[PDB]
């Protein structure tokens, strides 16, 4: 009768945060309960732990009360079969909503909506009798969102809150020898979802492995793994203290050993009962065993090395019990004069933050899709992740172990949408379901090697709860820091000077919450600790401008070490057109309403893990090996802090305006942060006009369990010598004839003619043949389809004025229209001369003014000089160069400058000068949310079918005009237009990504200089 879904749901436990569980059982590090100690030893799989994913029934209903009484004892027949784990939403049930900082409901805490999307799961499985004769049976839901019911053959059993972290209940009293039915009913809303407002898809369901556990009766309930370290680590001391369950008789003992492959380093064996702790005795069901390793192998993202843990319960007699494991990295994480420490090294981080995101699955993880994501990881140079903002699966803690990555362990609090955004973390009426998502986090996740520092969450403000929650983690785990940005980035929360998104010169001295310049920030009177960037560096599509600057700070100043980029991967997910052709989906593709449109999407990746143009900037910033030269002498130094370059050669190459002349490889052989110093062999020094540049790459000859033999670590280029070219060109056989129109200036020399337009004053055609080669005049054009830093939160709806594409609209800079000034011929004893002047208006005000001059002479090529003012009271514009839509449609592009990826002025560290062949495809950058894009710099040659242009431009070649970029919304609505667009540059405005809510753009790649000068030349070849 208290069974029925009446009376459990009268209790409304979901508008409660003072009920955050009932009958929910205590939390732990992983356990797998078993009875062999060599299968414990080896992490094979046991016969105690069942997994029950696969085949559930399903069925949705709009609010808890709608579910029928029916349902707790037998199957609905409306219901689907469907496969758990997995997020309903993704399968079509109802819509995922993407919204950032509002929260997806009516913000009144503690209530919900009535209008409560219900998700009844259903199982009927099966338990051998082996297990009701003897011990515990528990069932454990690895991730429930956001909170649940649970019934097992009819009967209550309990109830669950927190997203991100397992609730297991015990079911030994309710399971029967043969079929029983789970009735597990899924809330979308609860009082949980006031602390769960991350910047992310909002999902629901069993989304998290399901289990069940056999235990005895007599158990291990839990366990710690601590290693401590002499002043030089040739001496460590593991302890583990071992917690038992059940009746305590004195036969009881406990075994723990510890392995190195089928190595046994050490062991002990000892009764229960701990030392002394206070005047009413010690823990009797307690022991802590003290094992003594000498030069142990570290621990590091560098060289992960690994012991086995191996705890066993059993009698005097010999009689094993059961059995748990770990993994053991024997590691020191401590903060020491203001710097974070590892092994007694100064960390410096390579960091990113990475949410749980798939394109098909939603936030369903997979071991593929994480062992792709930390490959892809490595490959690139990062050290860390942060988990943003919440426990992982389990399985990403133990991967991170096993290949070697630093993690940020982050509890699930997030109220970012609260007014103050400390109104729940200040209230102590919320420290309880604050406390739970804290302490239960650091009790399953604290023996993992990987996890060096402890996080209290995410955008919550700083409210006393956090100081509360703060300590009683240094007093439970004191062997990692503690880190929170909440409330400023530096409160008496965080261990770390944790900002997000200061800034590396330029301050933002925001009331309460400054961010101020990471330089600065460390000098403020009072302040030791270290600043490592909680975010930083929004990788929201065309982004990643000045990056360099802040690695440049972090190298500089010992107490910047490093930060977490936002973020990994673009939160896109897949949708299908009327012919089942997929594309990406970002905010308000599902009817979701009110939603944040592309903020989704802020990754270095796509969805489907296609690196971004800016991951390869990233991979150079954040490369191990710094390099000098001085003459032909190479200062390699390593940024590496425990291992030698015992997988690297240094390949170089010499190189003359693209051609090769000198290559050779050397042994890299240098010691942690130590330096080699390499001597060339003597190099060309041919007398060829052209600039020499010399390129070196570090080149890992050996495959590792990351990457494949051949991987590029790092490179670096420097431009040897320069030979100006001082040789006349080869006198011509004939002189271009000008034909004058009232209409027109036409030019011709052999099978050549060129058109200038008197009317506009544009070059409006040019001939080779019969064939004509452009559908659009050669025009100025001082804009760009709009990035998304340009956009910023600017919306139709909300008019943000300070972003830059608002600047830009309201000076007229996208609906200027030219004004022809003048427009003349003129011949000469070697060529034609046309000579013009364009004024841009816009309601009566000059923007722009552009002179230039034409000049064709006999050898058929075409020298354009381009003279632009641009007055000093309009918004700098984002570019100054000519666009033209050619008729010609050549299946690759060659040229000569910073590539082969899309690079601007404030991202092209990571470009090498060289000649570059690729096909079109490439030259286009296919951002979900379309843009200028596929821009590359400092070029001095482009080949696009019979033409060639020849200065000192940056330029993009595609299928899509800046018009039809800037006025799609997605790419897959993107169509190929007639021909191929060209937009070359003198200039360009750098694309900024500091953030991209606020104008990012530093003052040097601003175009403010007022007067701009750049040289062309046109011709076949
Ligand atoms: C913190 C800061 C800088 C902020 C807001 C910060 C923010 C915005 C969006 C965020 O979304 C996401 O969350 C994810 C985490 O779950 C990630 O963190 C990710 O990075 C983001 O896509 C996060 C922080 N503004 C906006 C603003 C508005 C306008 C101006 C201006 O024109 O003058 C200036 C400042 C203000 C305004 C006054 C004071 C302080 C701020
Ligand atoms: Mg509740
Ligand atoms: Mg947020
Ligand atoms: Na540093
Ligand atoms: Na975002």
């Known amino acids: 009768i208290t069974d029925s879904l009446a009376v459990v749901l009268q209790r409304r436990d979901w508008e409660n945060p003072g009920v955050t569980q009932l009958n929910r059982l205590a939390a732990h590090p992983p356990f797998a309960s078993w009875r062999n100690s060599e299968e414990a030893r080896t992490d094979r799989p046991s016969q105690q ?26 199957d609905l027949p409306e219901a689907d079969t469907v496969v758990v784990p997995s997020n ?40 051998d009798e082996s297990w009701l004769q003897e011990g515990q049976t528990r069932i454990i839901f690895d991730g429930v969102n956001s909170a649940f019911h649970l019934w097992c053959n009819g009967r209550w059993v309990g109830y669950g809150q927190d997203s991100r972290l397992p609730s297991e209940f015990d079911l030994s009293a309710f399971l029967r020898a043969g079929e029983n039915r789970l009735a597990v009913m899924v809330l979308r809303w609860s009082d949980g979802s006031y602390l769960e407002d991350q910047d992310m898809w909002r999902m629901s369901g069993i989304f998290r492995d399901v289990s069940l556990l056999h235990k005895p009766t007599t158990q291990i309930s839990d366990f710690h793994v601590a290693t401590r370290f002499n002043d030089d680590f040739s001496r460590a001391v593991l302890e583990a203290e071992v917690q038992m369950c059940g009746e305590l008789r004195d036969y009881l003992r406990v075994t723990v050993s510890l392995w190195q492959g089928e190595t046994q380093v050490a062991s002990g064996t000892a009764p229960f009962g701990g030392e002394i702790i206070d005047e009413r005795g010690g823990y009797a069901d307690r022991v802590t065993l003290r094992l003594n390793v000498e030069n142990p192998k570290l621990w590091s993202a560098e060289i992960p090395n690994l012991y086995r843990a191996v705890v066993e319960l059993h009698t005097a007699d010999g009689t094993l019990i059961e059995a748990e494991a770990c993994d053991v990295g024997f590691r020191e994480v401590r903060i020491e004069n203001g710097l974070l420490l590892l092994n007694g090294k100064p960390l410096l981080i390579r960091g990113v933050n990475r949410h749980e995101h ?22 690139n140079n990062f050290n860390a992740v942060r988990c943003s903002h919440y426990p992982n699966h389990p399985l990403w803690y133990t991967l991170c172990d096993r290949y070697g990555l630093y993690v940020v362990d982050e509890a699930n609090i997030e109220t970012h949408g609260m007014v103050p955004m400390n109104r729940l ?18 009790q399953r996740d604290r023996n993992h090697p990987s996890v060096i520092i402890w996080s209290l969450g995410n955008e919550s403000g700083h409210g006393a709860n956090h100081d509360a929650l703060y300590r009683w983690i240094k007093s439970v785990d004191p062997s990692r820091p503690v880190q929170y940005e909440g409330g400023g980035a530096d409160t008496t929360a965080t261990d770390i000077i944790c900002p997000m998104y200061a ?3 330029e301050d933002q001295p925001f009331p309460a919450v400054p961010k101020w310049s990471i330089k600065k920030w460390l000098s403020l009177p009072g302040e ?8 930083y560096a929004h990788a929201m599509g065309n982004s990643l401008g000045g990056f360099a600057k802040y690695w440049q700070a972090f190298r500089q ?12 991967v673009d939160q896109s997910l897949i949708k299908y057109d009327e012919n089942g052709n997929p594309w990406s989906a970002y905010g308000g593709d599902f009817g979701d309403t009110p939603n944040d449109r592309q903020f989704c999407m802020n990754g270095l990746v796509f969805a489907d893990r296609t690196p971004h143009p800016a991951l390869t900037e990233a991979k150079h910033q954040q490369q191990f090996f710094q390099f000098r030269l001085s003459g032909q002498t190479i200062e390699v130094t390593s940024e590496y802090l425990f291992r030698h370059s015992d997988n690297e050669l240094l390949h170089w190459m010499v190189a003359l305006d693209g051609k090769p002349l000198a290559s050779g490889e050397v042994p890299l052989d240098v010691a942690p942060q130590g330096k080699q110093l390499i001597e060339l062999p003597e190099l060309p020094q041919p007398e060829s006009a052209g600039q020499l540049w010399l390129t070196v790459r570090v080149v890992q000859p050996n495959a590792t369990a990351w990457s494949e033999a051949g991987h590029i670590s790092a490179w670096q280029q420097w431009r040897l010598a320069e030979n100006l070219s001082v040789t006349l060109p080869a006198a011509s056989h004939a002189i271009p004839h000008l034909t004058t129109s009232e209409m027109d200036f036409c030019i011709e020399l052999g099978n050549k003619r060129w058109q200038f337009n008197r009317q506009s004053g544009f070059l409006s055609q040019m001939w080779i043949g019969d064939k004509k080669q452009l559908l659009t005049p050669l025009r100025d054009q001082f804009t760009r389809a709009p990035l998304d830093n340009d956009i910023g939160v600017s919306e139709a709806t909300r008019i943000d004025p300070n972003a830059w594409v608002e600047r830009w609209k309201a000076a007229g800079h996208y609906q200027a229209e030219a004004a022809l000034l003048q427009c003349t011929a003129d011949t000469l004893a070697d060529a034609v001369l046309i000579t013009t002047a364009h004024a841009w208006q816009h309601q009566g005000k000059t923007l722009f003014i552009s002179r230039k001059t034409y000049r064709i002479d006999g050898s058929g090529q075409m020298a354009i000089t381009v003279d632009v003012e641009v007055a000093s009271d309009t ?39 060289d000649r570059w062949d690729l096909p079109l495809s490439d030259m286009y950058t296919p951002y979900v949310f379309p843009s200028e894009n596929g821009l590359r710099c400092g070029t001095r040659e482009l080949n696009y079918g019979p033409h060639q242009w020849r200065g000192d431009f940056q330029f993009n070649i595609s299928r899509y005009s800046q018009q039809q970029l800037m006025e799609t919304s997605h790419r897959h609505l993107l169509h190929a237009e007639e021909g191929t667009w060209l937009n070359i540059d003198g200039f360009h405005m750098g694309i900024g990504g500091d953030d991209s809510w606020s104008p990012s753009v530093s003052a040097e790649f601003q175009l403010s200089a007022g007067r701009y000068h750049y040289q062309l030349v046109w011709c076949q070849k």
């Open 875 to 913: 918004p700098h514009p984002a570019r100054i160069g000519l666009n033209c839509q050619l008729a010609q449609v050549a299946e690759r592009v060659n040229w000569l400058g910073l590539g082969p990826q899309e690079n601007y002025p404030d991202r092209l560290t990571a470009a090498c000068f």
């Open 503 to 505: 800034r590396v010169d």
């Open 557 to 568: 100043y010992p107490r910047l070490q490093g930060g977490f980029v936002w973020d990994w």
């Open 49 to 74: 732990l069942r997994s029950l994913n696969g085949e559930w029934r399903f069925a949705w209903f709009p609010a808890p009360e709608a579910v029928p009484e029916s349902w707790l004892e037998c």
């Open 358 to 379: 798939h394109p098909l699955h939603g936030q369903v993880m997979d071991e593929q899709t994480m062992v792709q994501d930390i490959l892809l990881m490595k490959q």
């Open 425 to 442: 973390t200040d209230d102590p009426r919320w420290l309880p379901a604050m406390s739970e998502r804290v302490t239960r986090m650091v």
């Open 88 to 127: 309903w939403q993704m399968h079509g049930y109802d819509a995922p909503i993407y919204t950032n900082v509002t929260y997806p409901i009516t913000v009144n805490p503690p209530f919900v909506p009535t209008e409560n999307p219900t998700g009844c799961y259903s199982l009927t499985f099966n338990v």
């Open 528 to 535: 030791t600790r270290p600043l490592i960037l909680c975010q």
